[PDB]
Design an enzyme around this catalytic site. Sequence first.
Site, PDB file in Angstrom:
ATOM      1  CG  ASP A 115      -2.826  -2.346   3.630  1.00 20.45           C
ATOM      2  OD1 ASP A 115      -1.806  -2.952   3.140  1.00 20.45           O
ATOM      3  OD2 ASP A 115      -3.019  -1.140   4.102  1.00 20.45           O
ATOM      4  CB  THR A 116      -0.745  -8.190   2.805  1.00 22.44           C
ATOM      5  OG1 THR A 116      -0.240  -7.580   1.781  1.00 22.44           O
ATOM      6  CG2 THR A 116      -1.851  -9.131   2.391  1.00 22.44           C
ATOM      7  N   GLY A 117       0.124  -5.013   3.938  1.00 23.71           N
ATOM      8  CA  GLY A 117       1.337  -4.208   4.192  1.00 23.71           C
ATOM      9  C   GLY A 117       1.006  -3.614   5.420  1.00 23.71           C
TER      10      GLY A 117
HETATM   11  C1  TK7 Z   1       6.853   5.417  10.157  1.00 23.95           C
HETATM   12  C2  TK7 Z   1       6.952   3.793   9.588  1.00 23.95           C
HETATM   13  O1  TK7 Z   1       7.539   3.008  10.160  1.00 23.95           O
HETATM   14  P1  TK7 Z   1       8.455   1.586   9.617  1.00 23.95           P
HETATM   15  O2  TK7 Z   1       8.943   0.871  10.512  1.00 23.95           O
HETATM   16  C3  TK7 Z   1       7.088   0.856   8.329  1.00 23.95           C
HETATM   17  O3  TK7 Z   1       6.458   2.155   7.310  1.00 23.95           O
HETATM   18  C4  TK7 Z   1       5.713   1.544   6.417  1.00 23.95           C
HETATM   19  C5  TK7 Z   1       5.157   0.051   6.453  1.00 23.95           C
HETATM   20  C6  TK7 Z   1       4.304  -0.352   5.531  1.00 23.95           C
HETATM   21  C7  TK7 Z   1       3.661   0.500   4.546  1.00 23.95           C
HETATM   22  C8  TK7 Z   1       2.516   0.194   3.596  1.00 23.95           C
HETATM   23  C9  TK7 Z   1       1.127   0.784   3.851  1.00 23.95           C
HETATM   24  N1  TK7 Z   1       0.995   0.124   5.138  1.00 23.95           N
HETATM   25  C10 TK7 Z   1       0.489   1.079   6.344  1.00 23.95           C
HETATM   26  O4  TK7 Z   1       0.123   2.303   6.135  1.00 23.95           O
HETATM   27  O5  TK7 Z   1       0.149   0.489   7.623  1.00 23.95           O
HETATM   28  C11 TK7 Z   1      -0.093   1.273   8.852  1.00 23.95           C
HETATM   29  C12 TK7 Z   1      -0.801   0.643   9.649  1.00 23.95           C
HETATM   30  O6  TK7 Z   1      -0.203  -0.722  10.040  1.00 23.95           O
HETATM   31  C13 TK7 Z   1       1.150  -0.438  10.561  1.00 23.95           C
HETATM   32  O7  TK7 Z   1       2.129  -1.395   9.913  1.00 23.95           O
HETATM   33  C14 TK7 Z   1       2.665  -0.758   8.758  1.00 23.95           C
HETATM   34  C15 TK7 Z   1       2.556   0.888   9.178  1.00 23.95           C
HETATM   35  C16 TK7 Z   1       1.366   0.922   9.985  1.00 23.95           C
HETATM   36  C17 TK7 Z   1      -0.108  -0.032   3.147  1.00 23.95           C
HETATM   37  O8  TK7 Z   1      -0.018  -1.405   3.183  1.00 23.95           O
HETATM   38  C18 TK7 Z   1       0.048   0.530   1.937  1.00 23.95           C
HETATM   39  N2  TK7 Z   1      -0.460   2.111   1.633  1.00 23.95           N
HETATM   40  C19 TK7 Z   1      -1.677   2.338   1.196  1.00 23.95           C
HETATM   41  C20 TK7 Z   1      -2.968   2.134   2.223  1.00 23.95           C
HETATM   42  C21 TK7 Z   1      -4.197   2.399   1.365  1.00 23.95           C
HETATM   43  C22 TK7 Z   1      -4.324   3.947   1.093  1.00 23.95           C
HETATM   44  C23 TK7 Z   1      -2.626   3.351   3.343  1.00 23.95           C
HETATM   45  C24 TK7 Z   1      -3.541   3.072   4.457  1.00 23.95           C
HETATM   46  S1  TK7 Z   1       1.195   3.239   1.434  1.00 23.95           S
HETATM   47  O9  TK7 Z   1       0.787   4.771   1.890  1.00 23.95           O
HETATM   48  O10 TK7 Z   1       2.342   2.860   2.033  1.00 23.95           O
HETATM   49  C25 TK7 Z   1       1.226   3.266  -0.564  1.00 23.95           C
HETATM   50  C26 TK7 Z   1       0.147   4.218  -1.255  1.00 23.95           C
HETATM   51  C27 TK7 Z   1       0.391   4.154  -2.778  1.00 23.95           C
HETATM   52  C28 TK7 Z   1       1.262   3.307  -3.388  1.00 23.95           C
HETATM   53  N3  TK7 Z   1       1.388   3.280  -4.907  1.00 23.95           N
HETATM   54  C29 TK7 Z   1       2.188   2.289  -2.801  1.00 23.95           C
HETATM   55  C30 TK7 Z   1       2.047   2.379  -1.305  1.00 23.95           C
HETATM   56  C31 TK7 Z   1       3.953   2.089   4.611  1.00 23.95           C
HETATM   57  C32 TK7 Z   1       5.030   2.454   5.670  1.00 23.95           C
HETATM   58  O11 TK7 Z   1       9.722   1.953   8.639  1.00 23.95           O
HETATM   59  C33 TK7 Z   1      10.510   3.254   9.216  1.00 23.95           C
HETATM   60  C34 TK7 Z   1      11.752   2.251   9.901  1.00 23.95           C
END
Ligand code: TK7
Lengths: 99, 99
Positions: free
Chosen positions: A25-27
């Site tokens: 999960d690069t995100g």
């Molecule tokens: C409160 C947030 O704070 P923020 O700073 C950054 O928020 C975020 C940063 C990155 C992400 C992206 C998300 N990353 C994540 O959950 O990672 C968390 C653990 O690692 C740290 O690093 C980042 C956050 C935590 C996943 O890559 C992708 N997902 C699925 C995945 C597999 C089911 C879920 C585990 S999905 O749900 O998004 C999604 C689902 C269906 C779709 N068609 C499209 C997207 C979301 C929010 O922004 C506010 C200033």
Amino acid sequence: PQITLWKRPLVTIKIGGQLKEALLDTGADDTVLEEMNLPGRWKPKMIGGIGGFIKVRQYDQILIEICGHKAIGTVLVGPTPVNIIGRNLLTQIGCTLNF
Amino acid sequence: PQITLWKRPLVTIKIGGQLKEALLDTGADDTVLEEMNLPGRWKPKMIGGIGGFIKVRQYDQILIEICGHKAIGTVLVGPTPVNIIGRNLLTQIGCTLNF
Ligand SMILES: CCOP(=O)(COc1ccc(C[C@H](NC(=O)O[C@H]2CO[C@H]3OCC[C@H]32)[C@H](O)CN(CC(CC)CC)S(=O)(=O)c2ccc(N)cc2)cc1)OCC
């Protein structure tokens, strides 16, 4: 290996001597696994995703094998929808995005 | 290009005549962008991640340019904290994971 993305990039991992499936999960900044028993000390932590914030157990310096590549680092344990390998360990196994 | 994962894999995209920064996210099945007033028809959808679900608007056959690579497919729009390029479009630009 080279992994295309037509399907979810799921790989087998070994942690605590147990096998599991996890999503590369690069995100994700951090690695988060579903509820499990891990030995050693742990600190309560919070992490936020698309739906809000959850409470997790932070395990530091944990050995974990990802698709035949060893990593030692931080593993979060809690109610994540799926096991995810985040960038903190993807960097350790030398993983890059390429296009 | 090759993108290491020391930092978040953020790149510039071009959609609906706007430039934005978006995360190249192998963990996201589908692309989800921050709130923006796109034209055309759409369908409601719920997408889930860490913390639960959010409501988004699903637009189909939307052109997105990612690092000069053109892609067209489903784009979700809703209260995501970050612009996210998911696998549905990463495949179209030839993006792979490699280690
Ligand atoms: C409160 C947030 O704070 P923020 O700073 C950054 O928020 C975020 C940063 C990155 C992400 C992206 C998300 N990353 C994540 O959950 O990672 C968390 C653990 O690692 C740290 O690093 C980042 C956050 C935590 C996943 O890559 C992708 N997902 C699925 C995945 C597999 C089911 C879920 C585990 S999905 O749900 O998004 C999604 C689902 C269906 C779709 N068609 C499209 C997207 C979301 C929010 O922004 C506010 C200033």
